[PDB]
Amino acid sequence: MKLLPESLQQEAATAAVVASWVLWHLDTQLLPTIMREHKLHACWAAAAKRYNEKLFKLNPSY
Amino acid sequence: TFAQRLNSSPAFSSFLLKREKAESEVPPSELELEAAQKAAELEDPEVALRTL
Amino acid sequence: EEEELWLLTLTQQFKHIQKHFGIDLPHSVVAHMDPLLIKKIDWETTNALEDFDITLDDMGAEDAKEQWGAENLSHHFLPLIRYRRDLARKNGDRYGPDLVNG
Amino acid sequence: PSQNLVSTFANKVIVEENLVNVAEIDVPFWSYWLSSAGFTSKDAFVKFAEAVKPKVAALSTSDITNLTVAFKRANYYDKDLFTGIEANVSANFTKFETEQLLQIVATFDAFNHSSVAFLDDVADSITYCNHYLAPVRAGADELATLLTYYAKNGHERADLLATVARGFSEVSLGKLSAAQRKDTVLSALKAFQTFGFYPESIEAVIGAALVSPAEYSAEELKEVEAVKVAAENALGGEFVLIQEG
Amino acid sequence: EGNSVAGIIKSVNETSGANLLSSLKTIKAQAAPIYPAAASSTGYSTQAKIALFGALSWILYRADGQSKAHEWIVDLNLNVLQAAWLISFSSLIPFRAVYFAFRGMAPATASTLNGLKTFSSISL
Amino acid sequence: SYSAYFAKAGFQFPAGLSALVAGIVALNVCTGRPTKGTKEISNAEYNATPIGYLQSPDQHPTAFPKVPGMKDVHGSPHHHH
Amino acid sequence: VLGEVYLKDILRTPPTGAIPANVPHPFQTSFYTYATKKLIPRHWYLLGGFTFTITLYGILDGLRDSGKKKAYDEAIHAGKTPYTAGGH
Amino acid sequence: MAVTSFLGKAFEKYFYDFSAYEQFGLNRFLSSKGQYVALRHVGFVMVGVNVLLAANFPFNPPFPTIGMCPAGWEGTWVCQADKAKALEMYKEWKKSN
Amino acid sequence: SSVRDVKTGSLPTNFLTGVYRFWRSQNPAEKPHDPVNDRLLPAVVDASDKRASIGTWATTFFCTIISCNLLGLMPFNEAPTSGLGFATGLGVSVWATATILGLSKTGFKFPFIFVPLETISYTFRAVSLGVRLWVNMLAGHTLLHILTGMALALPFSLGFFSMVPATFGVCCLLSALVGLEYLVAVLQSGVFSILSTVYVGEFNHDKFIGPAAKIVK
Ligand SMILES: [Zn+2]
């Protein structure tokens, strides 16, 4: 069957172009979007006890 | 409610979720149903003033 | 009604995120409502700390995780303490929390 | 006549008077990159500083950073330009990153120029409008410049000092040469005692001098151990160098 | 576009007491957020036609070279075996259970937002 | 609410797909070698040869061959056996 | 009062006029910011590994044609045809 | 029609409620629907195999037969195991047929 | 110049969040001796500056291989990872990334008769990481070509839609091998990226800088 390709360097460079595009697309397009909505939730869930206690001490409405 | 806001989201108008309901996975609780109904009364800000 | 603009902007903005986050809120409306939270989140992605809350969870830093969340929303209190500082400067005094021993 | 035509072309077309006539369009681009190539030329930076003054109020934050560090390297202090720059920073303080503000302050610390509204809007921006680990990415020679600029102008902001003192560690001081670490440790301890603020990370800038005291004199180590005893009771304890074992 | 609370505060301050309670639904709706209305369809974008013609240009080109492949009837009967599982996956994958299972992979959607607990931010 | 804002923008490609397709095509056309079943000849041979004799039978297999190995063209009968 | 000059560019309400454009990340804006701040400081090990494979597989492609040229010349300097005469 | 809007509405009602597991009854013979789909699957393959073969039947098979012949052929070009042999026999058969 | 707008809580955003947080979970950061506070925060940020981005690299290799492996199960398509240079070119590139990372922990100088035997077993994991991906994508697809040639021999020889219990038992065996190929397509993209975190994570170890001076009590 077909085992070796016509060029091994052309198939190795197709793998490096595809995997460096996925590296670029993940780091630039996906992971900024992942972390913008992961860390809105995460900063709000980590600050929620200290945010509300700091806000309780600040507003004079009570 | 949360499941009622999921049903009108763009995810459930998609093809593979079009005949689905978000309440079928986790139904709204008894407090979530009674507080969506209480919040429907208070979307009139005159009703919210006279109640308060 | 002296500081009611700040306290009701906090209330209306969080109620709109909470109603819509994870359901249909666009990322453009988040970055409109909270531009400095998106600015500080983008600093972690730019400076290769996009897993910093996973790093603090790996090393069990539960009080540095609470400081990480609190320092990323610390600009929510900036419209107040810029107002209260411009009160105390107009009344000749010093702002309290600006001082070390005050 | 080939050499004559080239020499005639060189004395009327490629001079520095037409080099500053193409440099009138975008000023802070051309101001920044020329000054990085050693083009100091104090009469040319006069010509820069007036063609940019109708534009400083509408510049982006990376343009304002490009103006100030160019006019720091050119060492030309245009005071009615530099109030337009601090009115760009004070009007857009939320948009300035603290990597950019530490280069703007070090220009404003060279030419001793400060407002009180500028000193608050830089401290409000580093503390609240910027990531809290962004002092850690700064490099301690720029943070010590910011600490003295708040101690020269007598501006006590204890929230800013807790932010800038994050950026002092063994990591950030270890990236400095021991000549530059010495000019920083003495410059950061002189500012930390001016406000009397002794954070828990003052033991990394004190400890940067007590592992290698042989580059310090006697009155400088008298200046260091004045702060060391002032910090040990403030932090409620006793100083001890760690040796790794 | 200034903020809508300062639009609420200004528009409640400049009403009389007689028409305060009548005005409260037009001040409510002036500060409601915009949810843009369902526009005209105009389906299949300029890139949705490149995606469908380019996938048809790929499927025809791959079926062209499959048909002269020396095992052409073996190759063309493998597309029947492969497309049989695409059919059997639309009828067996629980697509609502999968949607809520991916929704729990992300901590942003596995829980509700947690800050700002309404007693801390009152203005009395 | 907000559901009709996300229906307005239709399909869209990934945000740098043009650099993937230009990168995969530029690896398949800038091979630096003849195009898989052809051989470079001189211009004196190319101008002298018919286009039926320039073709090889191996490079034109039959589109749905009734016998495995059927070819569409026959090429040059001037064989060097 | 606290009067909206203090909330400017700090806290905004949900938009009422139109949904704005999304704020780009600095990496989506320019490839030069991605390349110099993240691709080269953080992923140069991965780019070095893709570079090693493309050069190594160019060695093995160079060995395979120098082995084809070796077996080709030992058929034309042996009076044989260097392949199986096509098949058709 | 709108060429985008009609077929989506058409395929959806074919996809969702058009069920030949109920419109043809068929619960009388099969236990579940989980094994009606495991026979429509194998039924799709057997129909697809029998269509691809029959849509061009007089062909010499590339795949190895096990010494079996389709119909009354048995010595013709369709059953020949040598492929250069069957090419010569197909070219004789083609001018006659 | 204008980026697109993203809905929060999209399904591709939730899948890639869970995928990235999975591969980041494989090489976790180590807890220091000291408590993490503002004193230890530059030592934690510098500890993250010196760790490789294996959370990003392993989901680069997960998403580029599961997309290539599942192309082989789409009709009219072959998997790119059934090519020898593609699949072994990803395996050498992971192994070289681990080695370039392990060579930079020093000053790029390469490390009695024991060490040629540690090296061999180490240099073979260049070969084995890519060949395992290549052979699994080749040997599953090759067997499917053979058994659908043998399944085609029955309706070719016998009637069309005739003697159907013979072809039914081999059409369900063919259908159960395409189903196993969906399992091998997802497993081999998982095993490639699990092993990439193991190999690259061997050299993912640096010194915690930490406080060199302390005010105790
Ligand atoms: Zn195939």
mmCIF file of N, CA and C in Angstrom, chain H residues 42-97:
data_model
loop_
_atom_site.group_PDB
_atom_site.id
_atom_site.type_symbol
_atom_site.label_atom_id
_atom_site.label_comp_id
_atom_site.label_asym_id
_atom_site.label_seq_id
_atom_site.Cartn_x
_atom_site.Cartn_y
_atom_site.Cartn_z
ATOM 1 N N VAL H 42 -27.534 -1.152 9.824
ATOM 2 C CA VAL H 42 -27.074 -2.255 8.991
ATOM 3 C C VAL H 42 -27.916 -2.355 7.731
ATOM 4 N N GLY H 43 -29.175 -1.938 7.796
ATOM 5 C CA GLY H 43 -29.981 -1.867 6.596
ATOM 6 C C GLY H 43 -29.533 -0.791 5.635
ATOM 7 N N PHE H 44 -28.979 0.306 6.146
ATOM 8 C CA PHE H 44 -28.444 1.344 5.270
ATOM 9 C C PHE H 44 -27.201 0.854 4.548
ATOM 10 N N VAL H 45 -26.423 -0.005 5.198
ATOM 11 C CA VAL H 45 -25.202 -0.515 4.592
ATOM 12 C C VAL H 45 -25.534 -1.527 3.506
ATOM 13 N N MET H 46 -26.460 -2.449 3.791
ATOM 14 C CA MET H 46 -26.815 -3.477 2.820
ATOM 15 C C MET H 46 -27.536 -2.900 1.615
ATOM 16 N N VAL H 47 -28.367 -1.882 1.812
ATOM 17 C CA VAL H 47 -28.974 -1.199 0.677
ATOM 18 C C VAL H 47 -27.923 -0.412 -0.090
ATOM 19 N N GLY H 48 -26.998 0.224 0.626
ATOM 20 C CA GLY H 48 -25.955 0.986 -0.033
ATOM 21 C C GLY H 48 -24.921 0.138 -0.728
ATOM 22 N N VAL H 49 -24.654 -1.059 -0.217
ATOM 23 C CA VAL H 49 -23.775 -1.988 -0.919
ATOM 24 C C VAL H 49 -24.452 -2.506 -2.183
ATOM 25 N N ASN H 50 -25.713 -2.923 -2.069
ATOM 26 C CA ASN H 50 -26.443 -3.467 -3.204
ATOM 27 C C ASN H 50 -26.788 -2.421 -4.252
ATOM 28 N N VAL H 51 -26.786 -1.137 -3.909
ATOM 29 C CA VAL H 51 -27.012 -0.112 -4.920
ATOM 30 C C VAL H 51 -25.726 0.191 -5.667
ATOM 31 N N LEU H 52 -24.604 0.278 -4.950
ATOM 32 C CA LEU H 52 -23.325 0.600 -5.577
ATOM 33 C C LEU H 52 -22.847 -0.508 -6.495
ATOM 34 N N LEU H 53 -23.147 -1.761 -6.163
ATOM 35 C CA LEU H 53 -22.807 -2.851 -7.062
ATOM 36 C C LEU H 53 -23.705 -2.852 -8.288
ATOM 37 N N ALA H 54 -25.010 -2.721 -8.089
ATOM 38 C CA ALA H 54 -25.950 -2.832 -9.188
ATOM 39 C C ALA H 54 -25.923 -1.636 -10.124
ATOM 40 N N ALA H 55 -25.486 -0.467 -9.658
ATOM 41 C CA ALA H 55 -25.463 0.704 -10.525
ATOM 42 C C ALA H 55 -24.383 0.611 -11.586
ATOM 43 N N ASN H 56 -23.408 -0.267 -11.405
ATOM 44 C CA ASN H 56 -22.536 -0.686 -12.499
ATOM 45 C C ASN H 56 -22.189 -2.145 -12.223
ATOM 46 N N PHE H 57 -22.999 -3.049 -12.758
ATOM 47 C CA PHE H 57 -22.778 -4.452 -12.437
ATOM 48 C C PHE H 57 -21.736 -5.151 -13.309
ATOM 49 N N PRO H 58 -21.748 -5.061 -14.673
ATOM 50 C CA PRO H 58 -20.709 -5.792 -15.402
ATOM 51 C C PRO H 58 -19.360 -5.137 -15.196
ATOM 52 N N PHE H 59 -18.694 -5.495 -14.105
ATOM 53 C CA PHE H 59 -17.354 -5.012 -13.855
ATOM 54 C C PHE H 59 -16.533 -6.145 -13.284
ATOM 55 N N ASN H 60 -15.277 -6.162 -13.657
ATOM 56 C CA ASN H 60 -14.343 -7.086 -13.063
ATOM 57 C C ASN H 60 -13.983 -6.584 -11.674
ATOM 58 N N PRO H 61 -14.160 -7.387 -10.633
ATOM 59 C CA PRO H 61 -14.032 -6.882 -9.281
ATOM 60 C C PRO H 61 -12.586 -6.619 -8.905
ATOM 61 N N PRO H 62 -12.301 -5.451 -8.327
ATOM 62 C CA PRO H 62 -10.974 -5.231 -7.753
ATOM 63 C C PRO H 62 -10.740 -6.048 -6.509
ATOM 64 N N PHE H 63 -11.758 -6.267 -5.737
ATOM 65 C CA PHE H 63 -11.686 -7.025 -4.508
ATOM 66 C C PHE H 63 -11.555 -8.511 -4.818
ATOM 67 N N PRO H 64 -10.903 -9.280 -3.961
ATOM 68 C CA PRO H 64 -10.814 -10.718 -4.215
ATOM 69 C C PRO H 64 -12.133 -11.421 -3.991
ATOM 70 N N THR H 65 -12.684 -11.995 -5.052
ATOM 71 C CA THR H 65 -13.735 -12.982 -4.893
ATOM 72 C C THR H 65 -13.125 -14.277 -4.377
ATOM 73 N N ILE H 66 -13.974 -15.163 -3.874
ATOM 74 C CA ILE H 66 -13.457 -16.355 -3.215
ATOM 75 C C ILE H 66 -13.677 -17.518 -4.180
ATOM 76 N N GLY H 67 -13.513 -17.247 -5.465
ATOM 77 C CA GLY H 67 -13.764 -18.278 -6.440
ATOM 78 C C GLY H 67 -15.228 -18.434 -6.731
ATOM 79 N N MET H 68 -15.982 -17.353 -6.640
ATOM 80 C CA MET H 68 -17.392 -17.370 -6.952
ATOM 81 C C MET H 68 -17.648 -16.411 -8.103
ATOM 82 N N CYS H 69 -18.728 -16.675 -8.827
ATOM 83 C CA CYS H 69 -19.074 -15.969 -10.043
ATOM 84 C C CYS H 69 -20.506 -15.457 -9.953
ATOM 85 N N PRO H 70 -20.811 -14.300 -10.562
ATOM 86 C CA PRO H 70 -22.090 -13.623 -10.295
ATOM 87 C C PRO H 70 -23.344 -14.331 -10.779
ATOM 88 N N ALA H 71 -23.326 -14.724 -12.040
ATOM 89 C CA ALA H 71 -24.497 -15.250 -12.721
ATOM 90 C C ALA H 71 -23.968 -16.212 -13.763
ATOM 91 N N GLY H 72 -24.691 -16.388 -14.858
ATOM 92 C CA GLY H 72 -24.107 -17.098 -15.973
ATOM 93 C C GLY H 72 -22.990 -16.335 -16.665
ATOM 94 N N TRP H 73 -21.854 -16.149 -15.984
ATOM 95 C CA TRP H 73 -20.657 -15.627 -16.634
ATOM 96 C C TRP H 73 -19.527 -16.647 -16.580
ATOM 97 N N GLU H 74 -18.961 -16.918 -15.403
ATOM 98 C CA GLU H 74 -18.151 -18.084 -15.029
ATOM 99 C C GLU H 74 -16.879 -18.364 -15.831
ATOM 100 N N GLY H 75 -16.704 -17.745 -16.991
ATOM 101 C CA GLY H 75 -15.488 -17.907 -17.760
ATOM 102 C C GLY H 75 -15.195 -16.664 -18.562
ATOM 103 N N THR H 76 -15.989 -15.630 -18.337
ATOM 104 C CA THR H 76 -15.929 -14.419 -19.132
ATOM 105 C C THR H 76 -14.902 -13.469 -18.538
ATOM 106 N N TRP H 77 -14.988 -12.202 -18.924
ATOM 107 C CA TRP H 77 -14.087 -11.195 -18.395
ATOM 108 C C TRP H 77 -14.458 -10.770 -16.985
ATOM 109 N N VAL H 78 -15.721 -10.939 -16.592
ATOM 110 C CA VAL H 78 -16.170 -10.556 -15.263
ATOM 111 C C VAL H 78 -15.601 -11.466 -14.189
ATOM 112 N N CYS H 79 -15.284 -12.708 -14.518
ATOM 113 C CA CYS H 79 -14.822 -13.648 -13.513
ATOM 114 C C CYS H 79 -13.334 -13.930 -13.610
ATOM 115 N N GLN H 80 -12.608 -13.189 -14.433
ATOM 116 C CA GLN H 80 -11.208 -13.496 -14.662
ATOM 117 C C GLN H 80 -10.338 -12.915 -13.561
ATOM 118 N N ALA H 81 -9.491 -13.762 -12.985
ATOM 119 C CA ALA H 81 -8.657 -13.343 -11.867
ATOM 120 C C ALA H 81 -7.430 -12.580 -12.340
ATOM 121 N N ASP H 82 -6.978 -12.841 -13.563
ATOM 122 C CA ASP H 82 -5.904 -12.053 -14.151
ATOM 123 C C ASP H 82 -6.489 -10.831 -14.838
ATOM 124 N N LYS H 83 -5.975 -9.654 -14.491
ATOM 125 C CA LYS H 83 -6.630 -8.422 -14.901
ATOM 126 C C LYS H 83 -6.199 -7.941 -16.272
ATOM 127 N N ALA H 84 -4.965 -8.214 -16.685
ATOM 128 C CA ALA H 84 -4.591 -7.930 -18.060
ATOM 129 C C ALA H 84 -5.262 -8.891 -19.027
ATOM 130 N N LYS H 85 -5.621 -10.083 -18.555
ATOM 131 C CA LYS H 85 -6.382 -11.013 -19.376
ATOM 132 C C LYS H 85 -7.796 -10.509 -19.600
ATOM 133 N N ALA H 86 -8.447 -10.034 -18.537
ATOM 134 C CA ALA H 86 -9.844 -9.631 -18.618
ATOM 135 C C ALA H 86 -10.030 -8.327 -19.364
ATOM 136 N N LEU H 87 -8.995 -7.495 -19.433
ATOM 137 C CA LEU H 87 -9.070 -6.288 -20.241
ATOM 138 C C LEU H 87 -9.158 -6.616 -21.720
ATOM 139 N N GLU H 88 -8.413 -7.630 -22.166
ATOM 140 C CA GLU H 88 -8.520 -8.095 -23.540
ATOM 141 C C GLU H 88 -9.855 -8.774 -23.799
ATOM 142 N N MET H 89 -10.417 -9.447 -22.798
ATOM 143 C CA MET H 89 -11.692 -10.117 -23.007
ATOM 144 C C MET H 89 -12.857 -9.143 -22.928
ATOM 145 N N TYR H 90 -12.714 -8.053 -22.172
ATOM 146 C CA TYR H 90 -13.778 -7.057 -22.108
ATOM 147 C C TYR H 90 -13.864 -6.274 -23.409
ATOM 148 N N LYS H 91 -12.717 -6.002 -24.031
ATOM 149 C CA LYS H 91 -12.705 -5.274 -25.292
ATOM 150 C C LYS H 91 -13.286 -6.094 -26.434
ATOM 151 N N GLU H 92 -13.199 -7.422 -26.363
ATOM 152 C CA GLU H 92 -13.917 -8.263 -27.310
ATOM 153 C C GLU H 92 -15.411 -8.268 -27.033
ATOM 154 N N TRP H 93 -15.793 -8.321 -25.760
ATOM 155 C CA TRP H 93 -17.194 -8.363 -25.371
ATOM 156 C C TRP H 93 -17.903 -7.046 -25.635
ATOM 157 N N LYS H 94 -17.166 -5.939 -25.678
ATOM 158 C CA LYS H 94 -17.797 -4.629 -25.757
ATOM 159 C C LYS H 94 -18.304 -4.335 -27.160
ATOM 160 N N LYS H 95 -17.572 -4.769 -28.189
ATOM 161 C CA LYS H 95 -18.029 -4.526 -29.553
ATOM 162 C C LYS H 95 -19.213 -5.412 -29.914
ATOM 163 N N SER H 96 -19.282 -6.615 -29.347
ATOM 164 C CA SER H 96 -20.439 -7.475 -29.557
ATOM 165 C C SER H 96 -21.653 -6.940 -28.808
ATOM 166 N N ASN H 97 -21.509 -6.714 -27.508
ATOM 167 C CA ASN H 97 -22.579 -6.152 -26.697
ATOM 168 C C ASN H 97 -22.628 -4.632 -26.791
#
